[PDB]
């Protein structure tokens, strides 16, 4: 006695509300990577929550985890990471695109943590959020790959921003008298406008604020080194007048920081060498007392740097005098206990190691819906 399956009996699916998952057919995967990564321009996403691409990706992963489909998990992620890399090799000079994928890569990482299933990443979840966690798969290894990617992307973001700022620094900081009583060019306003633009991009795209703070710490470090290094080569800018101008310039940068709530980034602190050089230029340089004041004050300048500036120092009125050899020797004797670097110039390309925060959010996957403009109609809600 037999039974083929016959009202031909069929397995029907349970009808439930939006779980906040996103299923797709393996055959349609390149269209997905193509419309969600490769061909997605940051500006299409104006008017939605930041990092919707990362949430959407976690929602797809979630479903894949739920159907127990580890081929889908591996495929999707491996393919997404390659898509992003490919977009960044193509747009290797585009600050906006680079920051876009930094932001989204980081949020996708947060999602994989926040919904890992590890209770240590979940302390801040709501019950509803806790039920959007991965059930079957532990994706630790992919989290590691994503962390490596974000570092590579962050480095490309700094490279791009430094490339734009470089040709501006010396001219703006040293070759533009903008205040009274002291006697391709850029002004300081143009550096500040360029930094506004970077900042606005990073904000509009929901980059972690800890990352933003680090970006500007890093760029201020660059201004410090590039300006200081040029000054360590030139007599024509080592005068009290430049000292004051430079200090003023630095204070405008500092006020800019405060205005953007960036003052706790560490950026100010990275300028201490240039600030001390500016002060050194202004100070008296003749007596024993003068030399002691200089040695006490210039704790962030090496001996070689202090000596270079004193050697370069050039009065602008004949009514003032060049620093004497005896004065320099007095400085040299006083700075003996020091252990300074061998190289006169600062390394302007020095990179501070980035610390990426973990910032879980209160977005609920089951309230998230794809905007039609992404042309992902072939995705289906579960």
């Amino acid at each position: 006695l037999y039974f083929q399956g016959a009202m031909q009996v069929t397995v029907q699916r349970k009808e439930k509300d939006f779980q906040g998952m996103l299923e797709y057919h393996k055959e349609d995967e390149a269209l997905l990577i193509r419309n969600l990564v490769t061909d997605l321009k940051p500006q299409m996403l104006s008017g939605t929550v930041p990092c919707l691409p990362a949430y959407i990706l976690y929602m797809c992963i979630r479903h894949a985890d739920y159907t127990n489909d580890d081929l889908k998990v591996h495929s999707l992620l491996t393919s997404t990471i390659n898509g992003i890399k490919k977009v960044l090799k193509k747009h290797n000079d585009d600050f906006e695109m680079t920051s876009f994928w930094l932001s989204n890569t980081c949020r996708l990482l947060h999602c994989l943590k926040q919904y890992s299933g590890d209770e240590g990443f979940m302390t801040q979840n709501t019950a509803k959020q806790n039920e959007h966690c991965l059930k079957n798969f532990d994706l630790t290894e992919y989290r590691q790959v994503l962390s490596d990617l974000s570092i590579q992307i962050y480095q490309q973001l700094i490279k791009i921003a430094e490339g734009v700022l470089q040709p501006m620094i010396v001219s703006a900081m040293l070759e533009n008298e903008s205040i009274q009583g002291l006697s391709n060019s850029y002004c300081l306003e143009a550096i500040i406008r360029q930094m506004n633009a970077f900042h606005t991009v990073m904000c509009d795209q929901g980059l972690d604020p800890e990352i933003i703070l680090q970006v500007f710490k890093q760029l201020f470090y660059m201004i410090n080194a590039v300006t200081l290094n040029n000054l360590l080569l030139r007599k024509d800018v080592c005068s009290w007048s430049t000292g004051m101008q430079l200090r003023y310039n630095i204070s405008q940068l500092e006020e800019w920081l405060r205005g953007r709530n960036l003052h706790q980034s560490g950026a100010v602190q990275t300028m201490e060498p240039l600030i001390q050089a500016a002060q050194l230029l202004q100070l008296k340089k003749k007596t024993q007392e003068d030399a002691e004041a200089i040695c006490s004050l210039c704790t962030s300048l090496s001996t070689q740097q202090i000596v270079k500036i004193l050697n370069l120092y050039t009065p602008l009125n004949e009514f003032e005098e060049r620093v004497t050899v005896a004065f320099i020797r007095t400085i040299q004797a006083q700075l003996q206990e020091r252990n300074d670097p061998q190289q006169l110039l600062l390394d302007a390309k020095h990179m501070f190691p980035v610390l990426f925060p973990f910032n879980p959010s209160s977005l609920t996957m089951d309230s998230i819906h794809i905007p039609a403009c992404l042309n992902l109609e072939f995705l289906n809600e579960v």
Partner: protein, 171 residues
């Protein structure tokens, strides 16, 4: 942007509270552990006067001789000055004469000058009676106010008053 830019110098002995008058005025901050000013330092703030935008460019200077700029010639172009002493230290007030003489040796003759007795919160420690400092101001053609960067009393008023008086002279 702005319609007028007014360079204003802050001068007077070390410790009297110049840098804190400045931080209070420009961002409503006061710090008990203020570092001594080296050379000349700067902050700006814009205000409205007669419905016009006045950018105050404030030159904050060292009061300690070992921290001062080689030369006072930077006073040039200044339209205003605050000459600050500490009401709780008569010596800082005695030194106002010397600060004032130097200022007038290097500054333009239309400069507006305000004598400022700072730290008025230290009433229990007062060494300079108000009437004395006011008669000095009067006799020397200085305007006069007592301020406290600590509790903020008259700080806004000191700067608003000098900037407004400058606006009347130059507009």
């Amino acid at each position: 942007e702005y319609d007028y830019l007014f360079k204003v110098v802050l001068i007077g002995d070390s410790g009297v509270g110049k840098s804190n008058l400045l931080s209070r005025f420009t961002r409503n901050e006061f710090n008990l552990e203020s570092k001594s000013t080296i050379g000349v330092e700067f902050a700006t703030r814009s205000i409205q006067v007669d419905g016009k935008t006045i950018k105050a460019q404030i030159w904050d200077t060292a009061g300690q001789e070992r921290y001062r700029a080689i030369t006072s010639a930077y006073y040039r172009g200044a339209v205003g000055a605050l000459l600050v002493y500490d009401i709780a230290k008569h010596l800082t007030y005695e030194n106002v004469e010397r600060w004032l003489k130097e200022l007038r040796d290097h500054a333009d003759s239309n400069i507006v000058i305000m004598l400022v007795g700072n730290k008025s919160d230290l009433r229990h420690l007062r060494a300079v009676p108000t009437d004395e400092a006011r008669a000095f101001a009067e006799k020397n053609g200085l305007s006069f106010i007592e301020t406290s960067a600590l509790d903020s009393t008259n700080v806004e008023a000191a700067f608003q008053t000098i900037l407004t008086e400058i606006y009347r002279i130059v507009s």
